Amino acid sequence: SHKEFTKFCYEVYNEIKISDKEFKEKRAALDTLRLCLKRISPDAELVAFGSLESGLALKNSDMDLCVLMDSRVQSDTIALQFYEELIAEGFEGKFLQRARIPIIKLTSDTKNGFGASFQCDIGFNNRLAIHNTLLLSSYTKLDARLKPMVLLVKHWAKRKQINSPYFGTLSSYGYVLMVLYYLIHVIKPPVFPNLLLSPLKQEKIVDGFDVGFDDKLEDIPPSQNYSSLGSLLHGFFRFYAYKFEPREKVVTFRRPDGYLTKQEKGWTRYILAIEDPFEISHNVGRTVSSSGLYRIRGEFMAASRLLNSRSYPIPYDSLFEEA
Ligand SMILES: O=c1ccn([C@@H]2O[C@H](COP(=O)(O)OP(=O)(O)OP(=O)(O)O)[C@@H](O)[C@H]2O)c(=O)[nH]1
Numbered sequence: 001s002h003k004e005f006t007k008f009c010y011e012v013y014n015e016i017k018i019s020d021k022e023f024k025e026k027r028a029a030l031d032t033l034r035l036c037l038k039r040i041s042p043d044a045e046l047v048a049f050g051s052l053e054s055g056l057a058l059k060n061s062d063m064d065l066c067v068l069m070d071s072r073v074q075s076d077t078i079a080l081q082f083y084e085e086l087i088a089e090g091f092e093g094k095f096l097q098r099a100r101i102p103i104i105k106l107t108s109d110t111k112n113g114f115g116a117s118f119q120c121d122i123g124f125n126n127r128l129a130i131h132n133t134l135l136l137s138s139y140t141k142l143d144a145r146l147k148p149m150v151l152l153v154k155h156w157a158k159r160k161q162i163n164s165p166y167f168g169t170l171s172s173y174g175y176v177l178m179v180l181y182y183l184i185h186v187i188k189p190p191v192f193p194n195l196l197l198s199p200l201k202q203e204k205i206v207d208g209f210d211v212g213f214d215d216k217l218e219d220i221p222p223s224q225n226y227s228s229l230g231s232l233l234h235g236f237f238r239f240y241a242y243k244f245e246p247r248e249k250v251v252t253f254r255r256p257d258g259y260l261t262k263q264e265k266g267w268t269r270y271i272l273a274i275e276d277p278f279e280i281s282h283n284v285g286r287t288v289s290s291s292g293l294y295r296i297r298g299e300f301m302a303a304s305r306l307l308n309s310r311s312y313p314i315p316y317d318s319l320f321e322e323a
């Protein structure tokens with residue numbers, strides 16, 4: 001049935017989605033950071049990616065940003081100049097470099113009025129993240145059920161303490177791919193087609209990887225899946241609770257039938273295997289430990305049990321209660 005659960009899902013959806021107002025502050029912060037960048041490098045561009053760009057932002061959202069510049073210009077030089085201009089403009093944060101890759105991490109804004117905890121990560125030439133944000137952004141426009149589905153899943157994973165890459169669970173981006181995977185390759189009929197495997201997809205090579213997909217969205221026929229949000233969510237929890245085999249299988253967007261063993265791939269960390277759709281050497285779930293997976297699986301099981309429970313009224317609220 002799922003009528004009540006669906007009603008409940010939309011109610012939570014509206015409380016947790018980014019408000020127009022905060023979204024408008026975010027775009028202002030972005031404008032401010034761009035002006036600071038122009039002062040230091042007029043040719044470079046500052047772009048948003050992740051949840052703020054794809055339309056998948058919860059309240060109190062962090063910002064993922066990327067500086068695009070000429071590949072002949074050394075990224076660490078302008079990274080530092082940029083960082084020095086931010087400090088001088090009253091931002092607080094850190095300048096760091098992992099191997100070759102410089103990163104700025106802004107944690108605050110003492111002047112411009114964008115928070116006391118304004119959290120903002122600035123990368124340099126992370127073109128791949130821009131592209132995979134384009135993909136998620138495109139699926140978002142393809143069916144209206146995806147956005148609230150994702151926000152609810154993100155909310156759930158956060159409440160259940162299974163959204164921590166540093167303490168052995170999965171990034172939000174990983175849960176998005178787990179949602180997309182289910183909606184493309186598991187649910188029948190499919191909610192979505194695989195845009196990477198579209199016969200209309202054109203190759204596009206960026207940093208060695210094919211980032212190509214079919215983005216003529218207007219020419220794609222709508223879903224023949226008519227499930228309510230509630231139903232989709234129940235299918236999603238059920239599949240990862242009971243059917244998906246994490247020890248043996250890979251979440252993938254590179255197989256017409258979504259079938260990929262860990263072995264084919266040489267992925268025997270790989271406790272939870274999610275192959276990025278574009279950077280296919282990158283296991284999005286490499287942060288997941290053995291005890292993190294146990295907890296991720298347990299929470300999936302408990303979510304399936306709750307939604308399948310026969311004791312009425314079903315306490316749908318327990319879905320978002322702290323673990
Ligand atoms: O493994 C990763 C993780 C991150 N990303 C890139 O970084 C972006 C942000 O990564 P997040 O995990 O923060 O996604 P999110 O913004 O949607 O989640 P919340 O903040 O709402 O919790 C992702 O959308 C993707 O573009 C990767 O490319 N690979």
Ligand SMILES: [Ca+2]
Binds near residue numbers: 050051062063064
């Ligand atoms: Ca983010």
